Every structure is written in structure tokens, then in C-alpha cells.
């Protein structure tokens, strides 16, 4: 039996689903620790730009489960994607550790850019700008990719890198009630907010695992995109990220919210 994450819900993917929404032909890459091979994900290539780690699978977990959320199958096992049709990408960025250096991630950034993904989840960041992430989350943004990237985990009211640059759009993390979760970095910049607590995911070993974290919003909003993209491919990153922000369920204070929570549904209607 495939169990649909409380946040899956949350965000209204399956009334997408049912407009027979599901991010078939949109290119979205994973930009992480990489991503393990598990039944419930279909993974259609990627890269690895980390020293010493030329593989795509993933040593960590991180990565996996972010792209469970963005993309675990339709089927009868598992977990299910808010676009569970979409061609993922596994771009490997971030060491076993969880871990990676700006070039890496810059250099994932250029691969994404070059190879026509329509969207970027990053779910990652820090505390301290980088001009190297900047031209290239710039970069990939003029070759057309939506880069999507997670506020953080501080609890403070800035936001992280690359996050708080213009052109990655900000995520930030609600729990069950759609309150702030307390770790989620908020602040100018942030754009909007998804489920980020007790978030069940594929897992490295054909397993499930729950997590929590700006890592887990994140891809509700890549897999989002995804579903705006299929609806509407001719549209842009910028249309995209406009369409969904003005679609968003809006929570009130935009200082900690962004433009709300993500809703799939409205995105899609
Ligand atoms: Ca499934
Ligand atoms: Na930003």
C-alpha cells in the first residue's frame, strides 16, 4: 500500500494528479548528496561534481529523500511525489557527509543550466554569501532553470545562501498546522513556505525514513513547479515562481510566511 505523506496532502498535489498533473516531461535536478537507486523513484541520469564521489548514488540519505518528496512513484508501495512523472536528475553536490564545497555546487548548477533542467531543488545552504554561488544560480537561471532553494535551519530571521540571493526562489518550513516550524530560517527575501515536519520520504535500502527541515520543504515546491511546467510548458522560471507565489495560500505575516504555502490545487486550477 503507497501511504501519502501528511504534507503531500498538505500542499494539494493529488487534486493535481487527478487533472492528470504530474510533472511528466519536466527535468528537475536534485542538487545534493545524490540520489540512491530505489523502487520508488525513477532516476534518468545526473552527475557528480564532488572529488572522490563519481557516483550519483547517494552515501548519505539527504539527497534520496529530498527526491521522494519531489518525485516517489504513483503506484502501490511507498510514498508518492507532488510530481510523481518527473524526469529526476541526480546532481551530485554534496559529499556522504552532507557537505560541499561552492565549487560543486556552482559546477551542479552549470550541469543543470546546460542540460535543459526546467528546475533545481537545492536543499541546502549557509550562513556566509558566496559571489561564486550568486553568477551561478544566476547562471542557471538565464539558461532557463527554476532554482528552488531552502531557507534554513536556525530559527533566525535572515535566510541562508543561496537562498537569499534574488534568483533562487526561498522556501521555508511550516509544520502540521501550518505554523512556522521553529528551526526555519525566515526573514527578506523568503518567497514562500512548505511542509517541513515529521516528513515521511524514500530513504537509501529501499526504506522510509521521516525527517525534518527546510530540506523537506523544499521539494514540495520543486515538485510544484514541476506540475505548473507540465500544465503550462511554454511558461518561464519567472512565470513559474510568479504563478506560484500568487497562488500560494497566504498565512499573514509575509516577514516569516513568504507568500504562504504552497498549493498545488490553486497552481494548477
Ligand atoms: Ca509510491
Ligand atoms: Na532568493
Given at each position: 500500500?503507497?501511504?501519502?505523506?501528511?504534507?503531500?496532502?498538505?500542499?494539494?498535489?493529488?487534486?493535481?494528479?487527478?487533472?492528470?498533473?504530474?510533472?511528466s516531461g519536466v527535468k528537475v535536478a536534485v542538487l545534493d548528496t545524490g540520489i540512491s537507486?530505489?523502487?520508488?523513484?525513477?532516476?534518468?541520469?545526473?552527475?557528480?561534481?564532488?572529488?572522490?564521489?563519481?557516483?550519483?548514488?547517494?552515501?548519505?540519505?539527504?539527497?534520496?529523500?529530498?527526491?521522494?518528496?519531489?518525485?516517489?512513484?504513483?503506484?502501490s508501495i511507498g510514498v508518492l511525489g507532488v510530481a510523481p512523472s518527473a524526469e529526476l536528475?541526480?546532481?551530485?553536490?554534496?559529499?556522504?557527509?552532507?557537505?560541499?564545497?561552492?565549487?560543486?555546487?556552482?559546477?551542479?548548477?552549470?550541469?543543470?543550466?546546460?542540460?535543459?533542467?526546467?528546475?533545481?531543488?537545492?536543499?541546502?545552504?549557509?550562513?556566509?554569501?558566496?559571489?561564486?554561488?550568486?553568477?551561478?544560480?544566476?547562471?542557471?537561471?538565464?539558461?532557463?532553470?527554476?532554482?528552488?532553494?531552502?531557507?534554513?535551519?536556525?530559527?533566525?530571521?535572515?535566510?541562508?545562501?543561496?537562498?537569499?540571493?534574488?534568483?533562487?526562489?526561498?522556501?521555508?518550513?511550516?509544520?502540521?498546522?501550518?505554523?512556522?516550524?521553529?528551526?526555519?530560517?525566515?526573514?527578506?527575501?523568503?518567497?514562500?513556505?512548505?511542509?517541513?515536519?515529521?516528513?515521511?520520504?524514500?530513504?537509501?535500502?529501499?526504506?522510509?525514513?521521516?525527517?525534518?527541515?527546510?530540506?523537506?520543504?523544499?521539494?514540495?515546491?520543486?515538485?510544484?513547479?514541476?506540475?505548473?511546467?507540465?500544465?503550462?510548458?511554454?511558461?518561464?522560471?519567472?512565470?513559474?515562481?510568479?504563478?506560484?507565489?500568487?497562488?500560494?495560500?497566504?498565512?499573514?505575516?509575509?516577514?516569516?510566511?513568504?507568500?504562504?504555502?504552497?498549493?498545488?490545487?490553486?497552481?494548477?486550477?
Amino acid at each position: 500500500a503507497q501511504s501519502v505523506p501528511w504534507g503531500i496532502s498538505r500542499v494539494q498535489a493529488p487534486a493535481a494528479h487527478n487533472r492528470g498533473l504530474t510533472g511528466s516531461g519536466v527535468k528537475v535536478a536534485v542538487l545534493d548528496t545524490g540520489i540512491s537507486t530505489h523502487p520508488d523513484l525513477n532516476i534518468r541520469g545526473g552527475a557528480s561534481f564532488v572529488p572522490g564521489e563519481p557516483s550519483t548514488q547517494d552515501g548519505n540519505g539527504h539527497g534520496t529523500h529530498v527526491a521522494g518528496t519531489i518525485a516517489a512513484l504513483n503506484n502501490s508501495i511507498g510514498v508518492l511525489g507532488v510530481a510523481p512523472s518527473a524526469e529526476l536528475y541526480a546532481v551530485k553536490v554534496l559529499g556522504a557527509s552532507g557537505s560541499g564545497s561552492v565549487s560543486s555546487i556552482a559546477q551542479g548548477l552549470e550541469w543543470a543550466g546546460n542540460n535543459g533542467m526546467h528546475v533545481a531543488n537545492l536543499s541546502l545552504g549557509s550562513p556566509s554569501p558566496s559571489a561564486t554561488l550568486e553568477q551561478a544560480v544566476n547562471s542557471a537561471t538565464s539558461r532557463g532553470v527554476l532554482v528552488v532553494a531552502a531557507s534554513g535551519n536556525s530559527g533566525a530571521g535572515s535566510i541562508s545562501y543561496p537562498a537569499r540571493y534574488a534568483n533562487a526562489m526561498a522556501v521555508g518550513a511550516t509544520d502540521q498546522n501550518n505554523n512556522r516550524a521553529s528551526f526555519s530560517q525566515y526573514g527578506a527575501g523568503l518567497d514562500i513556505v512548505a511542509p517541513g515536519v515529521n516528513v515521511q520520504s524514500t530513504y537509501p535500502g529501499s526504506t522510509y525514513a521521516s525527517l525534518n527541515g527546510t530540506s523537506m520543504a523544499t521539494p514540495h515546491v520543486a515538485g510544484a513547479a514541476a506540475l505548473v511546467k507540465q500544465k503550462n510548458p511554454s511558461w518561464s522560471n519567472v512565470q513559474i515562481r510568479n504563478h506560484l507565489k500568487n497562488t500560494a495560500t497566504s498565512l499573514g505575516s509575509t516577514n516569516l510566511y513568504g507568500s504562504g504555502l504552497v498549493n498545488a490545487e490553486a497552481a494548477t486550477r
